[PDB]
Amino acid sequence: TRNGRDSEAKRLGVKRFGGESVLAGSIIVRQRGTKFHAGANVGCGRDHTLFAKADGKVKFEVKGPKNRKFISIEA
Amino acid sequence: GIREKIKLVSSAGTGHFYTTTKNKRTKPEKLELKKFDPVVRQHVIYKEAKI
């Protein structure tokens, strides 16, 4: 048998969902490639991680010519 | 393996240093990068030297 190997699971995905209030610095989405994109008051880390840059509620939206899921924050 | 490690020592200052890797076979010449000395609190030419 040349099988039976697997990595430790990562704990990826969304952590803060639509409407939920978040504090500056809180991670919103922890993903691999930019499946979600940074909008208003959101940054993108070197790990392609979307995190709050201000206090307020999470807003998931879909915008742009090529149609992509943007995450934004409004206080 | 292969890629050995080196000690970039500060010219203008104390014996503070940075450690980095270096493929010695491909690149024979010495690194002479400009980096920050925090003892002097100044950017300085850090010359390469072996451990």
């Binding site: - | 490690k5 450690t19 980095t20 890797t21």
Partner: protein
């Protein structure tokens, strides 16, 4: 007789005002060039022992 202290623990811990124990972080003796600075900075300052593994520390060094 008196309780002997686990001396190895006495050297690696220190009692604080509230009751907890400060300890030095691991992964900062050698093999440091490959470790990023941002780790090496956060592994420098002393850290409080977690409540999960406190009962072990309280037992093995009871006198302070």
């Amino acid at each position: 007789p008196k309780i002997k202290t686990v001396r190895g623990a006495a050297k690696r811990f220190k009692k604080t005002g509230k009751g907890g124990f400060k300890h030095k972080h691991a992964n900062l003796r050698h093999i440091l060039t490959k470790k990023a600075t941002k780790r090496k900075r956060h592994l420098r300052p002393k850290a409080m022992v977690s409540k999960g593994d406190l009962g072990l520390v309280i037992a093995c060094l009871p006198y302070a």
